[PDB]
Amino acid sequence: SGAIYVGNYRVVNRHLATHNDWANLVWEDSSRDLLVSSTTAQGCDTIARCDCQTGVYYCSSRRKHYPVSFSKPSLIFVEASEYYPARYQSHLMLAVGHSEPGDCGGILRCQHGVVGIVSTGGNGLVGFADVRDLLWLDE
Ligand SMILES: CSc1ccccc1CN1C[C@@H](C(N)=O)CCC1=O
Numbered sequence: 064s065g066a067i068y069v070g071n072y073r074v075v076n077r078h079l080a081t082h083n084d085w086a087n088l089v090w091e092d093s094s095r096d097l098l099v100s101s102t103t104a105q106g107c108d109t110i111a112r113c114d115c116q117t118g119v120y121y122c123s124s125r126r127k128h129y130p131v132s133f134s135k136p137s138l139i140f141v142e143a144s145e146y147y148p149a150r151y152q153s154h155l156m157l158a159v160g161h162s163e164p165g166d167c168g169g170i171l172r173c174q175h176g177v178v179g180i181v182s183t184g185g186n187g188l189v190g191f192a193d194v195r196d197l198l199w200l201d202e
């Protein structure tokens with residue numbers, strides 16, 4: 064689990080969104096596995112606005128942060144799960160690293176801020192849903 068809190072927004076994995084996230088829906092994209100909902104309290108996370116390909120992510124299945132090299136956002140084929148059938152997920156970045164389903168929501172960060180959140184894994188790979196293109200999260 065895990066969320067990004069920026070301004071009056073809350074960014075989560077779409078498959079993990081609650082009834083409250085859906086009742087206060089701002090934007091959602093099934094092909095990206097993202098959902099943004101509105102919050103009353105002001106969040107103070109900083110979103111990165113860059114093209115970095117190195118950063119650090121939090122892996123709850125190991126209680127550790129890991130430094131990783133990751134690919135640029137792209138259309139990557141993702142095997143079926145109980146939340147989605149086999150499909151292409153867009154704006155997805157892969158790294159060599161450990162990732163389990165319960166790890167979804169762990170933040171990936173570079174020196175500029177939050178890059179994205181854990182969304183996929185398996186075969187020794189970890190996939191992050193990118194958030195750097197969502198410029199409206201800051202306004
Ligand atoms: C070993 S499978 C795995 C591992 C880490 C993280 C996620 C998975 C599989 N997964 C993919 C998500 C997606 N974005 O389509 C939806 C929920 C889910 O459990």
Ligand SMILES: [Zn+2]
Nearest residue numbers: 113115173175
């Ligand atoms: Zn950066």
